[PDB]
Amino acid sequence: ADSDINIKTGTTDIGSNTTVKTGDLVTYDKENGMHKKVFYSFIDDKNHNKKLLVIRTKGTIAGQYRVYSEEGANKSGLAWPSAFKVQLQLPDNEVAQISDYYPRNSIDTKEYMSTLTYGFNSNVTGDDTGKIGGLIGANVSIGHTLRYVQPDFKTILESPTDKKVGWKVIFNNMVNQNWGPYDRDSWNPVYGNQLFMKTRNGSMKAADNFLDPNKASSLLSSGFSPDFATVITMDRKASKQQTNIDVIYERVRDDYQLHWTSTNWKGTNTKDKWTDRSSERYKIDWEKEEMTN
Amino acid sequence: ADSDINIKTGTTDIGSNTTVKTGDLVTYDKENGMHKKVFYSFIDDKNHNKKLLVIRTKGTIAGQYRVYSEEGANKSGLAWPSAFKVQLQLPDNEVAQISDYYPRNSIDTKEYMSTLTYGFNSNVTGDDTGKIGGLIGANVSIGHTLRYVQPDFKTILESPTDKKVGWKVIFNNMVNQNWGPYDRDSWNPVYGNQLFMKTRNGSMKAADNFLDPNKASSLLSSGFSPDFATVITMDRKASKQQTNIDVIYERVRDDYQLHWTSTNWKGTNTKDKWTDRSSERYKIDWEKEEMTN
Amino acid sequence: ADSDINIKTGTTDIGSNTTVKTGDLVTYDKENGMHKKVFYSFIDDKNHNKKLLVIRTKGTIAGQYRVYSEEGANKSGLAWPSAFKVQLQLPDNEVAQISDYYPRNSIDTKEYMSTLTYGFNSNVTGDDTGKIGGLIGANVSIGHTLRYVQPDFKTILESPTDKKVGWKVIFNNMVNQNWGPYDRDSWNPVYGNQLFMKTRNGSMKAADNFLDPNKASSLLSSGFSPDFATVITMDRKASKQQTNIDVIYERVRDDYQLHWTSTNWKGTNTKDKWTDRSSERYKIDWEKEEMTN
Amino acid sequence: ADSDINIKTGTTDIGSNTTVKTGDLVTYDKENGMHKKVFYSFIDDKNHNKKLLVIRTKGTIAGQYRVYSEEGANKSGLAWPSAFKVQLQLPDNEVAQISDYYPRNSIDTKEYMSTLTYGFNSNVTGDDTGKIGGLIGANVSIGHTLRYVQPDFKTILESPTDKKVGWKVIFNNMVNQNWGPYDRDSWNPVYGNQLFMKTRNGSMKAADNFLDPNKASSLLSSGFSPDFATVITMDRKASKQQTNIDVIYERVRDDYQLHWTSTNWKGTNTKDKWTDRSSERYKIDWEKEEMTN
Amino acid sequence: ADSDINIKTGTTDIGSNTTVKTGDLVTYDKENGMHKKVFYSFIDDKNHNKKLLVIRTKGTIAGQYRVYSEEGANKSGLAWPSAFKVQLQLPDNEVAQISDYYPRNSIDTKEYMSTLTYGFNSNVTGDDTGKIGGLIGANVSIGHTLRYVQPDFKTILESPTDKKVGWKVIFNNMVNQNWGPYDRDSWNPVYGNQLFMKTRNGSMKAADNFLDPNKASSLLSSGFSPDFATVITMDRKASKQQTNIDVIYERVRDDYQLHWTSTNWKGTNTKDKWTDRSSERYKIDWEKEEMTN
Amino acid sequence: ADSDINIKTGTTDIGSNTTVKTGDLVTYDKENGMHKKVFYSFIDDKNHNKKLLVIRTKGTIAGQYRVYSEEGANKSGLAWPSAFKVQLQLPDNEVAQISDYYPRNSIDTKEYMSTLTYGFNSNVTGDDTGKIGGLIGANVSIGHTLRYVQPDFKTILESPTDKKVGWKVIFNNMVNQNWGPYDRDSWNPVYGNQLFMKTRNGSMKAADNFLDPNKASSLLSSGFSPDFATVITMDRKASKQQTNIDVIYERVRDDYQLHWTSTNWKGTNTKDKWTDRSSERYKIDWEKEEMTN
C-alpha cells in the first residue's frame, strides 16, 4: 500500500478531478441461455498518459443441469456444466492494449500440524488365590495433519496477453450427500464415478437416480454470475480513435451416465462433451467516449 | 504508526497538495509469454527533499506447465515453473537511488502446544465360578504439537542495494491428490519424487500420467501476477535529469520426468533446467515527469 | 484512547495546521551489505512546547547465510545471522533529547487448558461352555495444556535513555523440515545441534549437507528490513540549533559447523562469532528544518 | 456508546472548537535506569465546566535482569523485576482533582466445556479348535474443560482517589523452556522454584545456570514502557491557578538464588528484595497552560 | 440500523447543529473508599420534543479485599466484595423522567455439539504351537458437548422505572490456582468452600492461608470502575426547571473464614455480611444547563 | 449493497437534505412493571413519495422471576417469564400503512463434520518359556459431528401485515449449574423437569430449592429491553392527516413447581399460566410532525 512507503493513501490512484462516462449494454442469448452484461467506464485523466476504459463483464451463464437422455429404465444421461469461461479479445491490428485485469491468480495456503506424544503406564492385578502380577509399558506416537480449503469451483485467470484476456471457473469437487468429495476423475471398481448418483442400488428408473439439483452446488443448475474487470489503455495521439472488442461467454458441459449393470448403479463421466459459445462484438469510440453493439 | 507517538495520522506522509503525474507502459513478450506492465507515478512534493518516482511492476508471467518430451510410452518429461523473478536495476553511473520497496520479508510464526495428562483406572472382574479379581493402574503422557502455515509459493524480497532491487516467488511445496506435501527434494526409494505423478502404477502412456494442471496450483499453468512497488529518489539539483532503468522478468523452469521402471512409475526432478529472461529498458525524464520505452 | 476519557479523537495529537518538512537519505554499505534509509520529518507545531524530528530507520540488512569454509569432504562451516541491530545515539553534549520510540516491548500471552474426565465401563463375557464372566471398571484423568505463539525472530526494544535508543531482532527458533523447533542452544548427544542439518547420515560433502536457504526463514538469507521510529525533541530557545546523530546498523553472525564423525553428521553452533557494524553520522539543522550526511 | 442511546457519535465528547496546548517533558534517571516522559495536553473548552489537563506517563523502566552475586561455583543470585509501578499524586492542599484515568481494570473471562459420552461395543472371538466366545460392553464418560488466557504480566489500576492515581504491572507467570508455567510461589521438594533455572542437574558454575534473557519475557531485561493517561480538572474560578504534581516511577526487584545440592540445582525466590523509586515534581500553570520541571 | 430500513445513517439521531453543555463532578468518599465521577451533558436540540441530560457514572469502587480478623493461628476471616452497585433515583415529585440507559441485559448464548461414531475392528492371533485365533468386533458411541463463556463478574441492569435506574456487577465464579471454578455456593464435605484457599493442608497461620490478591481477579482488591450511562428527559414547558437526583454507589462484602479443624483447612462463606453505601444529591438546572452538588 | 450493483453507497437511501422531527415518550406501568419508551422520528423527504414515521420501541419489561406460592416445606411454586412480546397495531380504518420493520427473521446455520479413519496394528508377545505369539489387526471408524449455537432467548418477528407488526422473545433453553440444557418440555421419570431445580435431593424447604436468579439468565429476573423499529408510511394527499396507533407490551409467565415426593425433588412446568398486558394509545399528527399520548 501507499502507507507502506510513506505516501498518503490514494496519492498514486487514477481518477482525481475527472469526469467518468459510464454505460451498460445488455444482451440475452436465448439459445445459449446466457445473460450478458457489459458495464463500461471511460476515464480521461489529464494527469495520466493514456485514455482508460474499464470493462466489467457481468451477467449470468445458466448451468443447465438437466437429464438429456434416457434409454429405457436401465440407462440415462445427465449433462452438467464443468466450466464457465469469459474472454475478451482485441484484433491484432488495434493499437489499444489490455493493461490490467481482476481477479488474478492467488497463492493457495495449507496448515501443517505435527504431533509427538510419549507415555508410560503400569498396573497391578490380583485375584482370590493370591495371584499377584504387574505390568509396566511405554508408548510413543508421531502424527501429521494437513488442513486446507477446497472450493466447489475454482476461478482462474488464464495467462493474458496485451490483446486478449480470459477467466475460467472450473468444477473442482463436490460433496454428495455427506460423502466424498467427488470430482470428474473419481473412480471405484464397483460404482464407477458417484459424482451425481442418488442411490447406489435403488430400484427405480435411471432418470430418477440423479442427485437433486437443490442438493448440489447452485452453480450447476441456476448458473454462475461473472464479475470480471479489465482495463484497456489507448494512446491519446493515435490516428484512429475507434476500437473493436470481442466478448465471448462459454459453457463446457460434461456427460454423466448411470447404468444398472445387474446389482448396483454405475456412473461414468465424459469430459467436455459439449461446448456452448456466445460471442459478441462491441465498438468503442474513444473520442465520443461511448461503447455500442 | 503516527498515533503511537502522539502524532496525527498521515502527518509525516508524502503527497499533500501535490500534483501527481501517472502513466502506464504495457509490453507483451511473445516468445517468453510475459505480459509486462509498468505503472509509474511522479511525485514532486515541495516539502520533500527529493523527487519521487513510484514504479509498480505488474502483469503476468505465464507458468507454461506442459509436457515437452515423450520417449515412447515408458518415458516422458514435464517442464514446470519453479520460480518467478522481477528485477529493477539502475546503471552504476546514475545519481538516482532506490529508496523504498514493497513487499518486504516478514517474520514467520508458529504455534506451540504442550500437553501433560495423567490418569488412574481400576476394575474388578468375576465369573460364575466365584473367581474374583481386580486391577489398579496408572498412566502418564506428554505431548507436543507444532502448527504453522505453508503457502504453495513464497514471495521473497532479495537483498536490495541503492541500484538494484528484486523479488522472487519460489515454489515451496504442493499437495498432490490429498497426499504430501511434496517439494522439489521429496524422495522415496520406490517412487522417487511424486510431485506431479498422477498414478503410482497406472497402465498408460507416460505423457498421460502427469497431474492435471487444474488439480495443481494455478500459478503452475496460468501463471503469476507480480504486484511489486519500488521508489526511486532523485536530487533536485542534479545536472542530468534523465535516468535509465532496466526491468527484468524471469521464469525458472524445472524438469520433471516419469519412467515406468518395471512395476511402478518413478519420478525425478531436475532443478533450474531452463531460464526464460525478458529485459526491458525505460527512460525517465524527471523534468518532463514521464517514462518511455 | 481519547474516547475512553470522553475526549474527541485526535484532540491531543500533534500536527494540526502545521507544515511538515520531510526528507529521505539513502546509503549503501557495500562491504557490510547494508541498505540504510533514513526518513525524517520536521514538525514545528506552534501549540507544542518543542520542535519535533521524527526519524524512521528503514532499508535492509542482508542476512548473508552462506557456507564460508570447507575442510575437505568431512568438515564445513556456515555463517548465519543470529541478530540484527539498529541504534540511534546523540552525543552527550547536545541538548536534544529522545522522547518517543516505536515499536516497544509487548506483554506475551499464553492460553491454558485444564481438563478433568471420569468414566465407568462394564462388560459381560461368555463362550461355548457356559462360562459367563463380567467386569466393571472406572477411570479418571487430569490433563493440562499450554498454547502460545513462537516467532522465528523476536523484535526487542533495548532499554532507551534520553541520548540513545536501540532495537534488536534476534533469532528465537526455527523448524527444520517439520522437525524441531531448534534454537542456538539445542543439543542431543548423537547429532549435536541440528539447526541447519539437511540429512542426519547422508553420504555427501559436508558443504552440501546444510539446509537450503529457501527452506529456512527468509530473514536468514535475503535479510531483514527495519521499520523503526524515534522522536527527538528540541527546545525552541536553545542557543545552538544544530545537532549530530549517529545511526548504527549491526549484524551478528553465528558459526554453524558440521562434521562427519564416524556414522552420522554432528552439528555445533558458536554464538556471536562475527559482528558487522555500519555507523553513519547525520547533521540536523533545526532552523533550516533539514538533515544531511 | 452514543449511538446506543439515539445520539450522534461524538456529541458528548470534549474538545470541539478548542485550541489544545500540548507539550512533552523528558528526564533520564541514570542511577535508576528510568526514561520518564510526560506528555501533557491543556484543554480549555468553553462548553465544559472545568479546565482539563491530560497527562500521559510514558517512557521505559529498565528491567535490569542480571546476576548480581556469585559465592563460588555452587551458589549465585539473580535480581529480576517483579513489578513496575507508576504513580501520580497531588498534594492535599490543592484544589485540582484527578477526574479520569486509563487503562482501568477489566473483567476476566473463561471458557467452560462439558462433555457427556456413552457407547456400546461387542465382539466375537474364536480359534481353530471351535471355541467360540463373545463379549458385550458399555461405557459412559463425563468431562470438564476450562480455557483462559494468562499474560506474562498483569496491568492493574490501583484504587484511585481524587488526589492520587496509580498503576502496577506485576509478574504473573512465565514459561521456562516449554515447561511450566512457573510463578513466584512455584515450589517442588526436589528443585524448589524453577522460574529461571536453565538446567536441572547441569555441571557448570551457578552463574551460568540462569535462564538466558532472550528466552524469557522481554520485560525482564529490556524493560516495560508505560502508556498511562490521567485527567486533572481545575475550577475556572479558583484563586490560585498553579498546581504541583508528583510523578513516581517504581521498580520492585525479587532475588532468585540457585544453589547446588549434592545431586542437583535448587532455586529459591525472595519477593520484594529491592525497590527503586524515581520521583519528580512538576509545576502546572493553568493560566499560562504549561507544565515545567 | 437505519441502513436496514433504507434510511441514511444517523438520520434519526439526536444532536445535529446543537450546542452541548458538558461538565464533570468529582467526589471522594474516604470512609467508603469510593471515587465518584459524574460526567453530564445537556443537549437542547430544537428538533427534539424534550430537553436531554446524559449522565455518565464513572470512577472506582475499591474492592477492599483484606483479612479483617484472626482468632489465633487456627482461625481467620476475609472480607471480599461480592457485588458493586450504582443507582440513580429521581424523587417522585419531579416531572423529569428516565428515558434511556446503557448497558442493558444481553441474551447469553452457548454452543452445542453432537457426535455419533461407529466402527468395526478385527484381528488374527497365533503362537508357536499353531494356535490360530481371530476376533471381530463393532462399537458405537454418542457424545454431547456444551461450550459457553463464564465471566468473573456479571454486569446486570436492574429493572428500571421512569424514576430510578440501577446496575449491579456481581461475582459469578473464579478460578483458584487452575482449580475450579468456585463460586459463593461451592461446597465439598472435606474442605467446604475453597474460593480463596491457598493450601488445603499447609501448616501456617490461618491469616497466611488466603489466596494472594495478585492471583485473583483485579476487581476484588483494586476495585471496579463503573461506566454507566442514563438519559433524563425534561419537558420544555414545565413550570419548574430544577431537578434533584440521587446517585448511590454500593459495595456488598461477603465474609470468608478458614478454620483448621484437625487435618486440613476448611472454608466457609457468608453472603452479604456488610454493605457500604455512599449517596450524593445533585441539583440540575435545566435553564442554566448546569449540574451542581 | 449499492456497491454490488455499481451504485455509490447511500445513493438510494432516504433522508438527504431533510429536517427530521424527533421525540420520545416515556411511560411506566407500575402494576405490570413495564418501562415503555417510544422514540419517534418524522421524515418528510421531498424526493420520497410518502411521509415516513420511524417508531422505535424501547424500555424494559421486568422478568419478575419470583417464588409466588409456598404450600409448606414440601411444595412451592415459581413464576417465571417465558415470553416477552411487543406489538404495534393500526386500526383498520386508517390509511397509514406499516412498510418496514427490524429486526427480521434470520436463517440459522449449522456446521457439519464427517470423519473416516482406518488403521492397522500388530504386536509380538513372548515369555521366559520360549513362547512366541503374534497378532495383526485392522480397524475402521466413521464419525459425524454437528455444531450450532443455541441462545437462551430467541427473537422472532411474527408475521406482519400492513396494519400490525409484532416481535416475541421466547425462552429457548438454559443451562442449570453446568447441566442441561433444559427447556420447558424437559422431562425425566425421576426428577421431572429440572429447569430451575437447585438440588436434586437437598433437605430444605421447597421455596429454598429454586435456582438463584444470579445463576440464571439475567432476562429472567432483571428483564428484557426491546430495541425494535417499525416504519409507517403516509400518503401526502390523504384527507385526514391524523393517525392512531396502539403499542402493546406483553409478558407471558410459566409456573414452575417443586414437590418433595418421598426421596427426591420433582419439578413440573406449566406453560402460559399468566399473561400481563400493557396497552397504550398514541396520536400521530403528520402535519404538525408530532406524537402524543
Curated annotation (Swiss-Prot), chains A, B, C, D, E, F:
SUPFAM superfamilies: Leukocidin-like. Its main location: secreted. Changing H48L: 7% of normal hemolytic activity, reduced toxicity in mice. One of its GO terms (molecular function) is identical protein binding. Pfam families: Leukocidin (PF07968). It is found in: Secreted. Gene3D superfamilies: Leukocidin/porin MspA. PROSITE patterns: AEROLYSIN. GO terms for cellular component: extracellular region. Changing H259 to I/P/R/S: Nearly wild-type oligomerization, hemolysis and target cell binding. Changing H48 to I/R/T: No oligomerization, altered hemolysis, near wild-type target cell binding. GO terms for biological process: cytolysis in another organism. Keywords: Cytolysis, Hemolysis, Secreted, Signal, Toxin, Virulence. Belongs to the aerolysin family. Self-assembles to first form a non-lytic oligomeric intermediate, and then, a mushroom-shaped homoheptamer structure of 100 Angstroms in length and up to 100 Angstroms in diameter. Interacts with human ADAM10; this interaction is required for toxin pore formation, disruption of focal adhesions, and hly-mediated cytotoxicity. Alpha-toxin binds to the membrane of eukaryotic cells (particularly red blood cells, RBC) forming pores, resulting in hemolysis, with the release of low-molecular weight molecules leading to eventual osmotic RBC lysis. Human RBCs bind much less alpha-toxin than do rabbit RBCs. Heptamer oligomerization and pore formation is required for lytic activity. The mushroom-shaped heptamer is composed of a cap domain (comprising 7 beta sandwiches and the amino latches of each protomer), 7 rim regions whose protruding strands may interact with the membrane bilayer, and the stem domain (52 Angstroms in length, 26 Angstroms in diameter) which forms the transmembrane pore. This is Alpha-hemolysin. The lineage of its organism: Bacteria, Bacillati, Bacillota, Bacilli, Bacillales.
